[PDB]
Each structure stands twice: as C-alpha cells, then as structure tokens.
Amino acid sequence: VLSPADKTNVKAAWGKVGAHAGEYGAEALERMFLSFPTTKTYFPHFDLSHGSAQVKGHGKKVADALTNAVAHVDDMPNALSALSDLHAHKLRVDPVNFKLLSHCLLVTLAAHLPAEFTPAVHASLDKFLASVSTVLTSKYR
C-alpha cells in the first residue's frame, strides 16, 4: 500500500525519465532477457537480439504504461484493466517474472538517475512496481 510519500517519491523519480522512456524501458527488458533467460519464453515470436527494433519499441510501451500507472496511482485496477487482461487472463505470466522485471527497472533507474535513487525513493519505487505487478497478475473481472 502506497503512502502519500510513496506516491510523491514515485512521481518525482519516474518524472525524470521524460524522453528517455523508450531507452530506459528497452534497457530494462534487455537486462531482464540477458540476466534471466527464462523470461524470454514469453516472447517466442519476438526478435530478442540486442538492439532489436522490436525490443526497443516494446520497451517504449512498457515505460509509457508505467507513466500511466504513476498518473493513476490511486485507481490502478481501473486504469490497468486492459493490461491485467493481457498478462493475467491471456498470457498467464508467472508472478516471479514480474519480480525480475521490477528488479531490472530498479537497476536501470539506479544506473541512469543516481541522484533520484535514494534509499527512501528506492523503497517507494519497489512498492510501486510490486503494486503494478499485483494488478497485472490478478484476475479481478
């Protein structure tokens, strides 16, 4: 459960992504695919080579979804319903993979935004990503 401080920490730190949305999201996926090869089995139809255009464009959709979640942090089940239908109903992604991608998003933020990634902000971003992960893996309609 996000505190009022959690929400303002996430808004400040994620707001620094800006035009780097596709870059950072792509990098987070690339980190995930290289570090945890089993995650690749959800993307068999993808070109997953490095610098793949498909991975980069997908990285942008991931980032933009997170931006939308930051903006709807108080009604994420409502705002993320389409993504829950995809990841929970249709893809049946094992929740462990959401922990792996969440970790890789934190690593990417730490590597690019060292001034933002303080210990309290690290804790809020972790809870935020856990909350997004819970919505996308629950069948609630």
Partner: protein
C-alpha cells in the same frame, strides 16, 4: 557458477574499483530500508528508526563491510561456493533462521548499489554476470536448508 572468461574479466575489473568502505554498508542499509522486517535481525545495531539513521549507522557500515568481504571471498572461489560459505550458512540458517528469500533480496540490493555507483559502466551484460554470482552466493548461503 560458470562465468565465461569474458564475464569473469568484466566482473573482476568492476569489482576491483568497488569502494570497500561504503558499498557493503549501502547494500545492507538499503536492505533494511526497502525490506524493513530485516531490521528485526539487527536489534543491537542501535538507531534504525529512519532511512538516514540506517544508512549513517556505523554498525551498519561496519557490518556491510563484512558482507562485501563475504562476496569478495565468493568471487575468489566461484568453483566452491558451498565450501567457502559452509560456516556462514550454518550461522544464517540453523542459528539466525533467515528466510532464504532474504538472501536473494540482499544479493539483488547489492546489484542495485553497483548500478548506482558505476552508472553506465554497469551494462546489461555486466549485470547478467553479477546476477549469476549473487544467485550462486544466495544458494550457497541457503545450503544448510537444502
């Protein structure tokens, strides 16, 4: 754990630059901040009541330095992590009863701290190499459960 010779060189290069006075205390500190229940294992460390207090706590910094030294020892013995960590595993499992999921959390917090310190030098391939190390260490620390 099996690092390729390319991965081993990249891991070793980056680890040689690690600030051994700070990196371990930052990883342990972040563990206690991001996963507050882990503070229950450190009652005698004094003030853990706020993030600034945790990170600045000299007992946290000193103990984090020991943690980092355990990872350095694992790095120097990738071919026998179970033997290198048998004593510590007895301590962490049979005595402290640390849930093994927390071993993995700390290893990944360490990864975040390396990312934080080295920025773009902590590439995805460098991270993948380090993910093999921390998983190896976490597994070895959990052995006396297995």
């Amino acid at each position: 754990v099996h690092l390729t010779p390319e991965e081993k060189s990249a891991v070793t290069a980056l680890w040689g630059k690690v600030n051994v006075d700070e990196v371990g205390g930052e990883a342990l500190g972040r563990l206690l901040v991001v996963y507050p229940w882990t503070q229950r294992f450190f009652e005698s460390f004094g003030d853990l009541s706020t993030p600034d207090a945790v990170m600045g706590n000299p007992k946290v910094k000193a103990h984090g330095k020991k943690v980092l030294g355990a990872f350095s020892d694992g790095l120097a013995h990738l071919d026998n992590l179970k033997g290198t960590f048998a004593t510590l595993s007895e301590l962490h499992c049979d005595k402290l009863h640390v849930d093994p999921e927390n071993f993995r959390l700390l290893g990944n917090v360490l990864v975040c701290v390396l990312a934080h310190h080295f920025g773009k030098e902590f590439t995805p391939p460098v991270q993948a190499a380090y993910q093999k190390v921390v998983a190896g260490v976490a597994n070895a620390l959990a052995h006396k459960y297995h």
